[PDB]
Amino acid sequence: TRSARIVVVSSRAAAGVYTDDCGPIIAGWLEQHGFSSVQPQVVADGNPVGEALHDAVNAGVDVIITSGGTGISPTDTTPEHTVAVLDYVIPGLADAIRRSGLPKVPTSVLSRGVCGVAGRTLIINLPGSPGGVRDGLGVLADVLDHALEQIAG
Amino acid sequence: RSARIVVVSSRATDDCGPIIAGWLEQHGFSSVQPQVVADGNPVGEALHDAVNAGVDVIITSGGTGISPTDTTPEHTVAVLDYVIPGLADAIRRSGLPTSVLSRGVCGVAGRTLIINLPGSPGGVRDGLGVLADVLDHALEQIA
Amino acid sequence: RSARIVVVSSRAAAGVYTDDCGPIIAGWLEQHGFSSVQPQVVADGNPVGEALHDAVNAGVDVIITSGGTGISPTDTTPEHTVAVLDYVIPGLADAIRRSGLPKVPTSVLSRGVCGVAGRTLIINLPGSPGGVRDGLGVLADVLDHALEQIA
Ligand SMILES: [Cl-]
């Protein structure tokens, strides 16, 4: 637990014509867990996602947290770009993040987020909504320290 | 349906291209990758290639004002068979901005519809909102 | 590194004008190894103070503002900036003013300041895309060292 990036995926927000409410949530939670102070990078759907992830992995960050672009809309390609960068996926973590918001938000099941490892960087896809983000960070909090420990040895 | 997106930037990140690409997917196109190009010859090249390819629609963004390098409308008129003045006017009248100054045109080149949009995300938004109400009919009439 | 851009214009904030300077500043930051930002766009006056305080609290490495540094009644960017700053960096402000000369002798009328608030570097740029490009030229060979000195 020490270094991280945040990538918020929204073409409108990235163009500066829309609010990013998810990024600040992630930044605050990271501050509570031994990182600090990370500022959101807001990028458009598509190639800019690949570009941000490769850049962050090649920086050797411990953790990348993404928000948005995981649904089933024409333009949601975050999972594809993430899988491309990943060495492998962590299915149980992605499933638990989906189930976290479920009670509750039944459409949770439509988020196609993955999590995985690339090099020694842990990557987490979260949904593009403030509640889905907070619920998924709650899931991550139960396992982050262990996950980072394991990746390091 | 087929399309190309030409983002005209003197700088040549593209903020408008992905917005237009997303709109087009909503309207039955694509996955279209925006081509970001400099003013001038590169605008010509992107238009000519798209017209040759026989795409249904070309959307451009930027280079429509009165700065020394703003020649998107000139390059557009150069490839058009004819202009559709009401559509350019409707795009200018959407949204309201200094732009009254956008000299964008719209028109048909062959069986390809070309639409000039301003180089701002808000101008693009407003423009696309106009297009949303006429695009199906326009493509039908051209065919 | 992280940055915020605060474009200061009531008309741009209102959607009445387009923000052309914000995107110019954003692209320059990316070439200098910044991950970051959307600009922000805020009205003249108190919103400026709001935006700087939010950005200083969040702990960003740099804030670049654009506009509101002139001598018209609604130009209050320098005021709100000095209110947030712990201290000014006079030589950087001066260097930014001079970057417009000799071509735009009215460049000397910008009352823009630079300084540090906490661990955040703040730089006032003028509201014209030419004053902005001219100011980024100054920053090119001092910004990395500035940030290193602050840290
Ligand atoms: Cl999502």
DSSP A35-62: ------EEE-SSHHHHHHHHHHHHTT-S
Q: Where would I find the beta strands (DSSP E) of chain A?
A: 4-9, 41-43, 63-67, 88-89, 115-118, 121-126
Name the residue facing A17 among B17, B31, B122 (closest C-beta). B122
Tokens in use for B9? Answer: 């930037």
- Substitution target in B8, B10, B14, B15 with the highest count of C β-carbons within 10 Å is B15
Phi, then psi, of B116 in degrees rounded to 5: -90, 125
Q: Which residue of B has its CA nearest to C38?
A: B15
Give chain B positions within 8 Å (CB) of A52.
Answer: none
State the burial class of residue A82 (Cβ atoms within 10 Å of its Cβ: 0-12, 13-18, 19+).
buried
Name the residue facing B97 among C17, C23, C30 (closest C-beta). C17
Q: Strands across the sheet with B3-8, in order? A: B35-37, B3-8, B57-61, B112-117, B106-109, B82-83
Task: Indicate the length of chain A as a whole number.
Answer: 153
Instruction: Find the Cα–Cα–Cα–Cα dihedral A131, A137, A139, A142, rounded to 10°.
Output: -150
Alpha-carbon distance of A96 to A102, in angstroms, equals: 10
Q: Does B27 touch chain A (CB under 8 A)?
A: no
Tokens 């990943």 identify what position?
Answer: A86
Alpha-carbon distance of B31 to A144, in angstroms, equals: 36
Phi, then psi, of A8 in degrees rounded to 5: -100, 125
Tokens in use for C96? Answer: 């930014």
Specify the amino acid at residue A7.
Answer: V
Contact B115, B57 (CB under 8 A): yes
Q: Where would I find the beta strands (DSSP E) of A10-130?
A: 41-43, 63-67, 88-89, 115-118, 121-126
CA distance, residue C27 to nearest chain B CA (Å) = 7
Task: Find all residues with CB under 8 Å of C8, minimum gap 6, and list them.
Answer: C41, C42, C43, C44, C48, C65, C66, C67, C68, C77, C127
Distance A70 CA to ligand 1 centre (A): 4
The C-alpha angle C94, C98, C102, rounded to 5 degrees, equals 160
Instruction: Find the Cα–Cα–Cα–Cα dihedral C135, C138, C144, C148, rounded to 10°.
Output: -100
Other C-beta atoms closer than 10 Å to the C-beta of C27 total 12
Domain boundaries, chain A: 1-153
- Helix, strand, coil shares, percent, chain C, to 5: 45, 20, 35
What Å distances lie between residue C34 and C31, C59, C100, C141, CA to CA? Answer: 7, 14, 25, 15
Q: Structurally, what CATH architecture does the domain formed by A1-153 represent?
A: 3-Layer(aba) Sandwich (3.40)
Experimental technique used to determine this entry: X-ray
SS3 C150: helix
**Rama region for A39: left / alpha / beta (φ>0; ψ in -120 to 50; rest):** beta
Q: With an 8 Å Cβ cutoff, are A5 and C38 in contact?
A: no
CA distance, residue C119 to nearest chain A CA (Å) = 12
Alpha-carbon distance of B74 to A100, in angstroms, equals: 55
Phi, then psi, of A67 in degrees rounded to 5: -135, 125
Query: What are the b/e assignments for C35-68, b being 16+ CB within 10 Å?
Result: bbbbbbbbbbbebbbebbeebbebbbbbbbbbbb
Distance A67 CA to ligand 1 centre (A): 6
Tokens in use for C66? Answer: 């654009």
Alpha-carbon distance of C114 to C12, in angstroms, equals: 23
Phi, then psi, of B3 in degrees rounded to 5: -160, 160
Alpha-carbon distance of B72 to B80, in angstroms, equals: 12
Tokens in use for A108? Answer: 């949770």
SS3 C10: helix
The C-alpha angle A5, C120, A49, rounded to 5 degrees, equals 25
Other C-beta atoms closer than 10 Å to the C-beta of A152 total 8
Q: Does B95 touch chain A (CB under 8 A)?
A: no
**Rama region for C95: left / alpha / beta (φ>0; ψ in -120 to 50; rest):** alpha
Phi, then psi, of A123 in degrees rounded to 5: -115, 130
SS3 C122: strand
Alpha-carbon distance of A82 to C50, in angstroms, equals: 36
Tokens 């927000």 identify what position?
Answer: A13
DSSP state of B34: P
Tokens 């509101």 identify what position?
Answer: C68
Alpha-carbon distance of A23 to B137, in angstroms, equals: 41
Alpha-carbon distance of A116 to A114, in angstroms, equals: 7
Tokens 């895309």 identify what position?
Answer: C129
Tokens in use for C82? Answer: 């000095």
Tokens in use for C99? Answer: 């970057």
Q: Does B44 touch chain A (CB under 8 A)?
A: no
Contact A64, C35 (CB under 8 A): no
Alpha-carbon distance of C151 to C148, in angstroms, equals: 5
SS3 C45: coil
Give chain A positions within 8 Å (CB) of B122.
Answer: 17
Q: Does B21 touch chain A (CB under 8 A)?
A: yes
- Substitution target in C38, C61, C64 with the highest count of A β-carbons within 10 Å is C38
Phi, then psi, of A70 in degrees rounded to 5: -100, -5
Distance A72 CA to ligand 1 centre (A): 9
CA distance, residue C85 to nearest chain B CA (Å) = 31
Give chain C positions within 8 Å (CB) of A37.
Answer: 58-59
Helix residue ranges, H only, B35-143:
41-52, 72-79, 85-93, 121-142
Name the residue facing A5 among C22, C35, C38 (closest C-beta). C35
Q: Does A71 touch chain B (CB under 8 A)?
A: no
- Substitution target in B64, B98, B126 with the highest count of C β-carbons within 10 Å is B98
Number of Cα atoms under 13 Å in the Cβ half of residue B143: 11
Helix residue ranges, H only, B12-120:
16-26, 41-52, 72-79, 85-93
Alpha-carbon distance of A27 to C36, in angstroms, equals: 13
State the burial class of residue B83 (Cβ atoms within 10 Å of its Cβ: 0-12, 13-18, 19+).
middle
Contact C33, C1 (CB under 8 A): yes
Phi, then psi, of C53 in degrees rounded to 5: -65, -40
Q: Which residues pair with B4 in a beta bridge?
A: B58
Q: Say whether domain C1-151 belongs to CATH 3.40.980.10.
A: yes
What Å distances lie between residue B8 and A66, B113, B127, C47, CA to CA? Answer: 30, 18, 16, 33
Closest CA to A1 of A141, A148, A122: A148
Give chain C positions within 8 Å (CB) of A38.
Answer: 2
Alpha-carbon distance of B59 to B115, in angstroms, equals: 5
Tokens in use for C146? Answer: 């500035």
Q: Which CATH code is given to the segment(s) B1-143?
A: 3.40.980.10
Q: Which chains touch A (3 or more CB pairs under 8 A)?
A: B, C
